[PDB]
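Annual report, structural modelling task.

Input specification for the iron/sulfur cluster complex:
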Amino acid sequence: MQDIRQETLNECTRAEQSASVVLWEIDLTEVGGERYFFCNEQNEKGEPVTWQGRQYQPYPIQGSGFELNGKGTSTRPTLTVSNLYGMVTGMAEDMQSLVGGTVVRRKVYARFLDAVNFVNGNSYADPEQEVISRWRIEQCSELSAVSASFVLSTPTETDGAVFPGRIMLANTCTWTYRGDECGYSGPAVADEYDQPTSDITKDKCSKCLSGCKFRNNVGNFGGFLSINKLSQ
Amino acid sequence: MQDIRQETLNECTRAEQSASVVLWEIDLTEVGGERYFFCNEQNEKGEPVTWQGRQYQPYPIQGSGFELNGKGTSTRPTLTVSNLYGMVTGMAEDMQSLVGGTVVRRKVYARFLDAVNFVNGNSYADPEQEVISRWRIEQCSELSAVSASFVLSTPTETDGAVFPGRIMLANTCTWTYRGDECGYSGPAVADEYDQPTSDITKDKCSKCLSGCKFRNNVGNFGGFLSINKLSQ
Amino acid sequence: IGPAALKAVYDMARKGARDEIQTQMRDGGLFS
Amino acid sequence: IGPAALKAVYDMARKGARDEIQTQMRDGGLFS
Amino acid sequence: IGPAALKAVYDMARKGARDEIQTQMRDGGLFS
Amino acid sequence: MKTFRWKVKPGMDVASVPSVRKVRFGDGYSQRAPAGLNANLKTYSVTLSVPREEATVLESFLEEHGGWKSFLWTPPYEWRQIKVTCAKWSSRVSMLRVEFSAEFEQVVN
Amino acid sequence: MKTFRWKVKPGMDVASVPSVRKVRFGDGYSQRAPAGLNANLKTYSVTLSVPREEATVLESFLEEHGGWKSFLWTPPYEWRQIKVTCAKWSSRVSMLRVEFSAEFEQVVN
Amino acid sequence: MKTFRWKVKPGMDVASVPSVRKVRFGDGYSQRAPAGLNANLKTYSVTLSVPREEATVLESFLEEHGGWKSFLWTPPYEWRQIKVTCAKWSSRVSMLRVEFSAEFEQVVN
Amino acid sequence: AMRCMPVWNGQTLTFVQDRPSDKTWTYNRSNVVMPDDGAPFRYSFSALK
Amino acid sequence: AHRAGLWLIKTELLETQTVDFSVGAEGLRHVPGDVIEICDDDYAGISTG
Ligand code: SF4
Ligand code: SF4
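The model returned the following structure:
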């Protein structure tokens, strides 16, 4: 079942419905950007739409093909944004083409916007009645001087992944540096190569046996020293 | 070659052709139903078309896509029938969606129908000149409240069948009850769960060793008593 | 008039391709 | 008319898909 | 016009079939 | 099964296209067949003009049969008493008279 | 629920196409069904003419209802108090009086 | 923002098609919605007739905005001061006076 | 194994199975919309093989 | 294993009908996915539902 409130569910069955507004939120904080609020529509005063106090500025946007299914390939709805004045290109070259971010789609009925969007003032206002979905951007399939097309995907999508993620053994380690399994917290001693150093900026581990010998941490080495089992 | 009589082949040479008539027979005796006779059109008297003495009633029927071939896939022509007043749905809800029945298509020329179909009376009637095909219904791809589409198939088509039907088992029989291998003809002794019953309506073997021991036909058991061939 | 016809034909062609794949993947045929 | 156009497009999107299936599996395609 | 529409529909059907082949061979589907 | 005795204004149009089975060969030799047993079914275009008083009566009668029931109607002077159905009708209402312009498609039993 | 009391000029057109489930046989016997309960829904083409000073008022009314709200209207002399919505209207502002042409589609509640 | 003070000839056209969200159900009961908030946007068809001497001036002004800039224009007698763009102007130069036949599409801010 | 199916429902991955449950909502001719064909409900059945 | 096989055969034998239809906005927002609802149809039931 959905989390839709009783009153909006009751209203949705009415024969004379109101306008349907769709608002989009693009979040890049997990990538290193900001939060952008877009709305395909504005109010009657030529102003950005005010919802829950915040303002969604008017900007071109259109979502298509939102499907949910349990069988076959996971659905990939698309999003179209007009790239005029190079606004999208301004962040595409900075945020690595908007790959890895999050998009949030909220749908709302027109009779629940804030009173400031209507000249007379809506008395039937409730800022806690909306339907929310979230997806992640996958790729920018098209980018030109007039538009831009993004593909969306479910966060849980399991394309191109393998279940057991261990290589068992090698001549090299198979973890991170200073994680919760390597368990190193000392001063800098080694860098990308096997060269002594004492700066925290260029602390790197070659993930070989020599790095462990340098860091006096061999008991946590993730490489089984077999080698000759394949030969002999 | 076809079983085409000389007279109809000779008639099918002249420029001024007669009217082609197609009649359909749905046979459900092998599945538990009756024989239905359909024709796409009626005579000039507003009466069912009389052929070979029997009568075909008018009903909207259309067969399309009869493609006999030796390579690639099999043949799956489509039969469309108008489902008005719920007539098709009535038998579909009863005859398991018309699955397993037979359809016979007979094509005839107009100048060979019975004399009762014409006000003047045809003097060229010959109720032995027609072309006959038979198919089996595979599925009801779509039956709405206005129509119904059936997929047809050849009776001898192989799909999902394996050649070596024999299967080696350990403690389960492989054949039917009383059919040919279980040469049992005595009173009912067992039931599904191997209970001591003596009623014939509930006598069904459990397909085990205990059932055979109950019925004293262990000499005709299909399950080889190997079991322990993979442990050692 | 314009891109509406293009979208219609695109969806129709995709559906036809799906049907062709399904019918060719079956026992008979070239086993796509 | 509608249904004639729809049947025409459906039947036209058959041999196109068949040829695509056949060419993409020959030497250096995706093997259908 | 006949031939121009025919060639356009054929090419669009080929593109649609290629796109369907590409999209159905990702992780699931019928794995064409 | 009701009938149709309303007067018909002059200028009634008649159309008839028999359904035939045409197939052409190299030099003519075109095989032709009558297709169905009763192929051609005439369709009439009929216009009436009545004062407003019984425009309601005509509209009600045309509404009763809807677009599915058939009704007997004798074409003017024609040797047949055929049964017909209609599915389109329009009216130009004026302050004195209203004129109807309908089409009557012949169907058999 | 508002009403529509403006006058309608002569020549207003009425169209009616009831919905039926056509399905054809070889020849004749074509089965027919009445489809839904409310099959036919008349479509009206209404012409008006008002002096310029009045026109704005009518416009505002047609603005208030938009193309999504229904309003009662009585067709001239017709025995029915139907409910109708409009989504197409145009006008000719010539010199003194402006004439409107609008379409009115019948809708159930 | 510039203003349009050129005077317009009789016969100007105004057209209005509201954008509504329509879905029809079983026996009627069509759900209707207003779609966007400012759904209604009029479209005018405007004809002028000016002597050739100032004809160039019109073109110059109509060249300045191209088809991407909006200018304010008060329609005749109408209670609104709206902003409108045009992209399809044409002229009929004959001997002494050229007539212009353009279309003016209303656009929100 | 557990006779389930995963779906991205309500912005969360959830799993459904053929557990006997109660009715949720009802539909008839009034709540559904028919296409141009004439009938709103389209049924289909499985195949013999 | 026997229970799994029995479930497969029984589910495949009994559930043999699939129906598709359309629904307005209210129903679209109502049903999230993979729920149980009654689709009562007077056409198939030759009655007045
Ligand atoms: S190699 Fe030794 S030090 Fe470098 S990461 Fe793996 S464990 Fe930590
Ligand atoms: S088990 Fe023994 S008895 Fe039961 S069927 Fe197979 S053979 Fe006949």
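The pocket of iron/sulfur cluster (ligand 2) is lined by residues B 173, 175, 177, 182, 205, 207, 211-212, 215, 217, 220-222 (CB under 6 Å).
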